[PDB]
């Protein structure tokens, strides 16, 4: 009859961890005679190389050491202690994340230059993966009395109201201009800020009258 030599230390099956970092799943036991330790992935025999990097479990320490973990490893791992007089088993659910310690990444082409009639109401978009809480802003490349670039060598701009709300896409980042006089013809920038530096794209808008050619 087998038993968990260390029960108290076995209620933590949730093991959320960062990628490429060795993991050690164990569950100490004993009995008469020494019971076997069976493993499995998701719920079926976990081969001693059942995956890349392979494993190296110490069937003696009642452990299952895995190195350089990967999201593809995230899977409720279960230990099985079977003995002639009894068979016990407990399961640990593993996960693996891959943090993106960068600035916000913004799909290209977005925003993208566009045109519109006066009094036309427009939008500009922005996809932004960004693990770290981003702080997206929409600038307007205004030109302070004379030049577009001030003594800081960096362009003059102005944060924009927001023009509306969420609505459309809960995955995008639009800016909605409305009566678009031949005054919003400047350049618009999407400045995605982040704990880890800033990222950003830009684009142009051009507005004309009502006939043409």
């Amino acid at each position: 009859a087998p038993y968990w030599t260390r029960p108290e230390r076995m209620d933590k099956k949730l093991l959320a961890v960062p990628a490429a970092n060795t993991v050690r799943f164990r569950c100490p036991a004993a009995g008469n005679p020494t019971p076997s330790i069976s493993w499995l992935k998701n719920g079926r025999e976990f081969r001693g190389e059942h995956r890349i990097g392979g494993i190296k479990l110490r069937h003696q320490q009642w452990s299952l050491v895995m190195e350089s973990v990967v999201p593809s490893d995230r899977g409720n791992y279960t230990c099985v202690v079977e003995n002639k007089f009894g068979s016990i088993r407990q399961t640990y659910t593993l996960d693996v994340l891959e943090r993106s310690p960068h600035r916000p990444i913004l799909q290209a082409g977005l925003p993208a230059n566009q045109t519109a009639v006066l009094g036309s109401d427009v939008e500009f978009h922005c996809k932004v993966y960004s693990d770290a809480q981003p702080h997206i802003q929409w600038l307007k490349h205004v030109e302070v009395n004379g030049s577009k670039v001030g003594p800081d060598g960096t362009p003059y701009v102005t944060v924009l109201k927001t023009a509306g709300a969420n609505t459309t896409d809960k995955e995008l980042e639009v800016l909605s201009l409305h009566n678009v006089t031949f005054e919003d013809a400047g350049e618009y920038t999407c400045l995605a800020g982040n704990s880890i530096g800033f990222s950003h794209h830009s684009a142009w808008l051009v507005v004309l009258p009502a006939e043409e050619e």
Partner: protein, 151 residues
């Protein structure tokens, strides 16, 4: 080399606006999912079903962020004592400073009491940790985001 459609026709190979969706705030210390109890007190829990672990973050400025629940609307905060509660209104008491530590774990520092380095960790049993109680280095303060459900 396998692959699929979608990413092959995509225009961006990362989940767009993924910061808008809500997530759980694990805690490297125990195995808990930060919880802002309906009443208003905060604590730990493993119950991957606890209807009060679904946090919705956001940043009004770089690095500074609000931690919030998707059930109520409690703007988690830290009182002058070092107690994490859950204001109903957004206020200086509820602004945290987020940072992705080399151990790829995030840490929240009570912006207001930043100077003293008070974190939003969780004491082993899973109970909230008194501000002053935290120390930069203890797993208690090492939180690690998680998707609402498994896969």
């Amino acid at each position: 080399e396998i692959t699929t459609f979608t990413a092959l026709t995509e225009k961006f190979n990362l989940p767009p606006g993924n910061y808008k969706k809500p997530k759980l705030l694990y805690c490297s210390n125990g195995g808990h999912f930060l919880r802002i109890l309906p009443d208003g007190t905060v604590d730990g829990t493993r119950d991957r079903s606890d209807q009060h672990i679904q946090l919705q973050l956001s940043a009004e400025s770089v690095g500074e962020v609000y931690i919030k629940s998707t059930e109520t609307g409690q703007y988690l905060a830290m009182d002058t004592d070092g107690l994490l509660y859950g204001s109903q209104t957004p206020n200086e008491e509820c602004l945290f400073l987020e940072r992705l530590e080399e151990n790829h774990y995030n840490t929240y520092i009570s912006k207001k009491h930043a100077e003293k380095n008070w974190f939003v960790g969780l004491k082993k049993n899973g109970s909230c940790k008194r501000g002053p109680r935290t120390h930069y280095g203890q797993k208690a303060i090492l939180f690690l985001p998680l998707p609402v459900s498994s896969d």
